[PDB]
Design an enzyme around this catalytic site. Structure first.
Site, short mmCIF file in Angstrom:
data_model
loop_
_atom_site.label_atom_id
_atom_site.label_comp_id
_atom_site.label_asym_id
_atom_site.label_seq_id
_atom_site.Cartn_x
_atom_site.Cartn_y
_atom_site.Cartn_z
N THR A 146 49.47 10.71 -24.41
CA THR A 146 49.05 11.84 -22.89
C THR A 146 48.31 12.24 -23.07
O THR A 146 47.85 12.80 -21.30
CB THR A 146 50.62 12.10 -23.54
OG1 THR A 146 50.64 13.09 -24.76
CG2 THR A 146 51.86 11.29 -23.60
N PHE A 186 55.87 19.30 -20.47
CA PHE A 186 55.94 18.99 -21.73
C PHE A 186 57.20 18.92 -22.51
O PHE A 186 58.13 19.70 -23.54
CB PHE A 186 55.44 20.22 -22.47
CG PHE A 186 54.47 20.18 -22.74
CD1 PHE A 186 53.28 19.38 -22.71
CD2 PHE A 186 52.90 20.60 -21.42
CE1 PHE A 186 51.67 19.21 -22.70
CE2 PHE A 186 51.67 20.90 -21.09
CZ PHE A 186 51.01 19.85 -22.13
N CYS A 191 57.49 19.98 -26.31
CA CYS A 191 56.71 19.00 -26.63
C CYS A 191 56.34 20.20 -28.07
O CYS A 191 55.56 20.79 -27.44
CB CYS A 191 55.54 18.63 -26.09
SG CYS A 191 54.07 18.36 -27.20
C1 HEM Z 1 49.21 16.21 -22.22
C2 HEM Z 1 49.17 15.92 -23.40
C3 HEM Z 1 51.41 16.08 -23.90
C4 HEM Z 1 51.92 15.59 -22.82
C5 HEM Z 1 51.76 15.14 -20.96
C6 HEM Z 1 53.56 15.37 -23.80
C7 HEM Z 1 54.33 15.60 -23.57
C8 HEM Z 1 55.80 15.28 -24.24
C9 HEM Z 1 57.34 15.42 -24.62
C10 HEM Z 1 57.97 15.12 -22.29
C11 HEM Z 1 57.77 15.13 -25.35
C12 HEM Z 1 59.43 15.59 -25.16
C13 HEM Z 1 59.95 14.22 -24.87
C14 HEM Z 1 61.30 13.43 -24.78
O1 HEM Z 1 62.09 15.00 -24.88
O2 HEM Z 1 61.84 12.96 -25.61
C15 HEM Z 1 57.25 15.98 -26.42
C16 HEM Z 1 57.39 15.46 -27.66
C17 HEM Z 1 56.18 15.79 -28.56
N1 HEM Z 1 54.96 15.97 -28.28
FE1 HEM Z 1 53.59 15.97 -26.92
N2 HEM Z 1 52.65 15.76 -25.01
C18 HEM Z 1 51.92 16.03 -25.37
C19 HEM Z 1 50.92 16.06 -26.28
C20 HEM Z 1 51.18 15.92 -27.61
C21 HEM Z 1 50.44 16.27 -28.90
C22 HEM Z 1 48.60 16.47 -28.24
C23 HEM Z 1 51.46 16.07 -29.76
C24 HEM Z 1 50.45 16.36 -31.79
C25 HEM Z 1 49.38 17.01 -31.38
C26 HEM Z 1 52.73 15.65 -28.96
C27 HEM Z 1 53.25 15.38 -30.03
C28 HEM Z 1 54.64 15.78 -29.76
C29 HEM Z 1 55.62 15.35 -31.02
C30 HEM Z 1 56.07 15.68 -32.60
C31 HEM Z 1 57.11 15.68 -29.80
C32 HEM Z 1 58.10 15.98 -30.48
C33 HEM Z 1 58.74 17.28 -30.37
C34 HEM Z 1 60.23 17.41 -31.43
O3 HEM Z 1 61.58 16.70 -30.43
O4 HEM Z 1 60.41 18.03 -32.45
N3 HEM Z 1 52.01 15.53 -28.09
N4 HEM Z 1 55.65 15.47 -25.41
O1 LIG Z 2 62.97 5.43 -17.73
C1 LIG Z 2 62.59 5.17 -18.69
C2 LIG Z 2 61.04 5.56 -19.59
C3 LIG Z 2 61.08 6.49 -20.27
C4 LIG Z 2 59.57 7.23 -21.18
C5 LIG Z 2 58.72 8.27 -21.89
C6 LIG Z 2 58.31 8.36 -23.28
N1 LIG Z 2 57.45 9.53 -24.42
C7 LIG Z 2 57.91 10.71 -24.59
C8 LIG Z 2 57.02 11.41 -25.03
N2 LIG Z 2 55.89 10.53 -25.09
C9 LIG Z 2 56.37 9.75 -24.66
N3 LIG Z 2 63.42 4.41 -19.80
C10 LIG Z 2 64.17 4.13 -19.75
C11 LIG Z 2 64.43 2.43 -19.27
C12 LIG Z 2 65.82 1.84 -18.89
C13 LIG Z 2 66.91 2.25 -17.87
C14 LIG Z 2 68.04 1.61 -18.35
C15 LIG Z 2 68.09 0.67 -19.08
C16 LIG Z 2 67.02 -0.19 -19.93
C17 LIG Z 2 66.26 0.65 -20.26
C18 LIG Z 2 64.75 3.61 -21.27
O2 LIG Z 2 64.12 3.26 -22.06
O3 LIG Z 2 66.07 3.55 -21.64
#
Ligand code: HEM
Ligand SMILES: O=C(CCCCCn1ccnc1)N[C@@H](Cc1ccccc1)C(=O)O
Ligand code: HEM
Ligand SMILES: O=C(CCCCCn1ccnc1)N[C@@H](Cc1ccccc1)C(=O)O
Lengths: 445, 447
Positions: free
Chosen positions: A258, A383, A390
């Site tokens: 990302t 994030f 994140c």
């Molecule tokens: C611009 C860069 C980044 C973006 C846009 C981003 C975005 C996100 C998002 C949206 C989530 C939550 C996903 C969810 O709820 O399923 C997440 C979780 C996470 N990210 Fe990132 N991230 C970035 C950079 C990073 C970096 C640099 C690291 C590690 C050094 C990292 C490690 C993680 C981890 C471990 C989680 C899970 C946290 C937890 O649930 O405890 N990410 N990130």
């Molecule tokens: O919309 C999305 C995209 C989400 C991915 C982001 C992953 N990330 C998080 C941090 N860095 C990366 N995903 C749905 C698609 C789906 C919907 C209904 C039925 C089958 C599949 C899913 O996976 O469920």
């Protein structure tokens, strides 16, 4: 109550064939453009609801009502990332345990410790571009991935991927794209177990080989140090060997993909908006007065940080996250949900909510972020949310601000092909084929 | 580099230079002569006046400089206490009140204020519709009527009913004579001399009259500013404001919430009547956008050129003309002016806004088109609302009110500069064009 819109269906396959595309996030944004702030999406054996308005998403971000859900994408990732931080449920013992152990690895004392190694990789990037011949060009997402992969390898694990010594990507990267490609293909298969499976197991093995090498090799005080020696204050326990392996896999991927996308989109928007590029370059020249930036100098790159946030507004490189209802509840006063019902937050659409940002949402204007206080809660969520937000946010933004600052200090950039934005989708977003030319300002390192 | 300094008066240093009715304009003339920075000394005080974007962009670095209370703000603090505008950033009540009151300027809140702003704006339009032939408008007087009524109603659900009065309310007149006393006191070598006992007695009466208004407002007491003051909790500490600080916030917002906005509307109308091509362009926008009897919130957001008119009026005559800063640690300004921890700076906003390296050679011309694109404006070139976390909390309130009102004025009247008014800028702690009068010919468009 209020009946929920739903896109076109394909018989017993319901909405599933709508995801049979190279750009599913962009397909879902177009559906949200047509149907509005919420629409149901059905597949065989699954129902979810895609949210696009700040009004509904702010309720979804209420942690007393909704918890993080593992999307099907995250369940795929869990097949090799296990109960690492990003693919564990909040109620699994290893989430809170690893969270407590690793959160100090992203404190500001920790960022000050990572800074010198981030500069190491950033200098390699600057030197590569300084050494290009006339009329040669830069493959931007390729070089940004070289940088961000090397940075997480070095800062986190004291391992050198040495990506700038290679013309093609590492074995790790190539295999993981093919596994994801297969995973997405299997979703559209009615009979997956019909006698493809073998390559995925091979891909799970390549990554394990790099993980064993990183562990055996390991005086250092980085992310891997905390993984191996830190103790959770609540349970008093350290991470076990199995979970450590999952965390290494998690951070190697989450720690670079990302962030590479963000740098690539930021440079795209700069070259398409020359007034913004001039303003950002003026800041970089004024603030970065030494041959290598200090930690404090990076913190002074305010406008560069605004450029990065505005790039994350338009193209959040992790484009969605998923939630489930902890109990029966009513969303927005009009959509009743039962315990366990799933939601998807469509981040690029949230970030285009005209009732929040105004009618000019498609314009790239870093000045939107001049005053952080003016942005409503849960309007800007690149994030994620809450305790499952994140963990690497400060790491990513420090790295990207440092690197973009050095790029703007050392080169003038030209959009020499008049590049037409083409967003390739993995689980993340990046601008495919984005190329520029860089003319050195001849400022030594 | 050795810092320039204006002429001195022996042991009084530069202090007699401020013994004038127009100190900001005196300081601009000194900046014209001495350049982007000059030292200013008084008995017991040293400060440095900055006028170039080159230096002010460094001063706006919050890691190096924090908001300072100028002597003017220390005066205001004698009755505004630790309210938002006169508190130090490190005082507990600044961040606490900031967190509690910032939701009162969110866009959900602004949408809630809109109808009450329209209420007062309609009263202004009706007053001017009801003038007889050859009668004229006292512009800053009526703009103050409008902005005072608007903050009273939007902030506190209190009606000052300024359009029902031919003279200003007692507290307004009370406010200025207190300031007059304060500015006279700067020049006194011996302020505790018995000769000034009569002066002190009057100052306390003024603090009482304003305090008498605050008691009336609280006694009366919606989902408005006072509601948040009385019921909001700071998310960090979990605490609400105490009664003493609430009183200070009411005093703060009653003054800060109207004076600078009245000056802005007055200068904006001044520049429009002096620039007929610009006035025509703004009137054409108002006619095109304001198609309903009263403007909607969304329509006000669409008065793009009117908003540019307001920003260009703030460029030439920022009605809050200065703010003060202090060095958080030893530092070097501009690579050549060393500063010690605690050293103070003054940002001279009207001079910053006349920096020809930023705006070009026509800096004195009124051209709203300068503000077409905020990305084209260099960083920290334009600071009429201050800087950083201590920037104006009411900026969007002020701009929405002024855009709404100026839009309605342009929709409903043609204006004549019938006296060929000669600009005369009266200085309180803020700026306004004294004696500015116009004639308004109704376009006869009903409300
Ligand atoms: C611009 C860069 C980044 C973006 C846009 C981003 C975005 C996100 C998002 C949206 C989530 C939550 C996903 C969810 O709820 O399923 C997440 C979780 C996470 N990210 Fe990132 N991230 C970035 C950079 C990073 C970096 C640099 C690291 C590690 C050094 C990292 C490690 C993680 C981890 C471990 C989680 C899970 C946290 C937890 O649930 O405890 N990410 N990130
Ligand atoms: O919309 C999305 C995209 C989400 C991915 C982001 C992953 N990330 C998080 C941090 N860095 C990366 N995903 C749905 C698609 C789906 C919907 C209904 C039925 C089958 C599949 C899913 O996976 O469920
Ligand atoms: C055109 C109109 C206005 C102008 C030019 C203006 C200007 C300013 C400036 C320059 C500052 C910073 C002063 C300093 O740094 O010492 C400030 C702060 C402040 N203003 Fe305004 N202002 C305007 C309208 C308003 C309105 C409408 C309100 C209230 C509704 C308001 C309330 C405040 C407050 C409370 C502060 C202190 C903020 C803090 O320090 O937390 N102002 N204003
Ligand atoms: O320049 C100014 C005017 C500043 C007033 C701004 C008031 N405002 C702020 C927000 N809305 C109104 N004030 C100096 C004068 C002085 C210099 C040296 C020695 C003595 C006095 C000061 O007050 O310190």
């Amino acid at each position: 109550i209020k009946e929920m819109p739903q896109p076109k269906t394909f018989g017993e396959l319901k909405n599933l064939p709508l995801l049979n595309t190279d750009k599913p996030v962009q397909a879902l944004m177009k559906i949200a453009d047509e149907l509005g702030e919420i629409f149901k999406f059905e597949a065989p054996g699954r129902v979810t609801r895609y949210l696009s308005s700040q009004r509904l998403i702010k309720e979804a971000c209420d942690e007393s009502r909704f918890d993080k859900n593992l999307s099907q994408a995250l369940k795929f990732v869990r097949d090799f990332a296990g109960d690492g931080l990003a693919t564990s449920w909040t109620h699994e013992k290893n989430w809170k345990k690893a969270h407590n152990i690793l959160l100090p690895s992203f404190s500001q004392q920790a960022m000050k410790g990572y800074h010198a190694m981030m500069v190491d990789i950033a200098v390699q990037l600057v030197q590569k571009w300084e050494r290009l011949n006339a009329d040669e060009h830069i493959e931007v997402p390729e070089d940004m991935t070289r940088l961000t992969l090397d940075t997480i390898g070095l800062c986190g694990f004291n391992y050198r991927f040495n990506s700038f010594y290679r013309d093609q990507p590492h074995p790790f990267i190539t295999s993981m794209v093919r596994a994801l490609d297969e995973a997405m293909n299997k979703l559209q298969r009615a009979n997956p177990d019909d006698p493809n499976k073998r390559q995925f197991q091979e891909d799970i093995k390549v990554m394990n080989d790099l993980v064993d090498k990183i562990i055996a090799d390991r005086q250092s005080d980085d992310l891997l140090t905390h993984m191996l020696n830190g103790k959770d204050p609540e349970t008093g326990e350290p991470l076990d060997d199995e979970n450590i392996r999952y965390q290494i896999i998690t951070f190697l991927i989450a720690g670079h993909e990302t962030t590479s996308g963000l740098l690539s989109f930021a440079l795209y928007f700069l070259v398409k908006n020359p007034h913004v590029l001039q303003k950002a370059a003026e800041e970089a020249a004024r603030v970065l007065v030494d041959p290598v930036p200090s930690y404090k100098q990076v913190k002074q790159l305010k406008y560069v940080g605004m450029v990065l946030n505005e790039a994350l507004r338009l193209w959040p490189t992790a484009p969605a996250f998923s939630l489930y209802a902890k109990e029966d509840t009513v969303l927005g006063g009009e959509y009743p949900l039962e315990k366990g019902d799933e939601l998807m937050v469509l981040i690029p659409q949230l970030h285009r909510d005209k009732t929040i940002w105004g009618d000019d949402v498609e314009e790239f204007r870093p000045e939107r972020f001049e005053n952080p206080s003016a942005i409503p809660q849960h309007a800007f969520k690149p994030f994620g949310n809450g305790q499952r937000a994140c963990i690497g946010q400060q790491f990513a933004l420090h790295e990207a601000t440092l690197v973009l600052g050095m790029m703007l200090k050392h080169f003038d950039f030209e959009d020499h092909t008049n590049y037409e934005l083409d967003i390739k989708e993995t689980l993340t977003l990046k601008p495919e084929g984005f190329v520029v030319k860089a003319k050195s300002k001849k400022i030594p390192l």
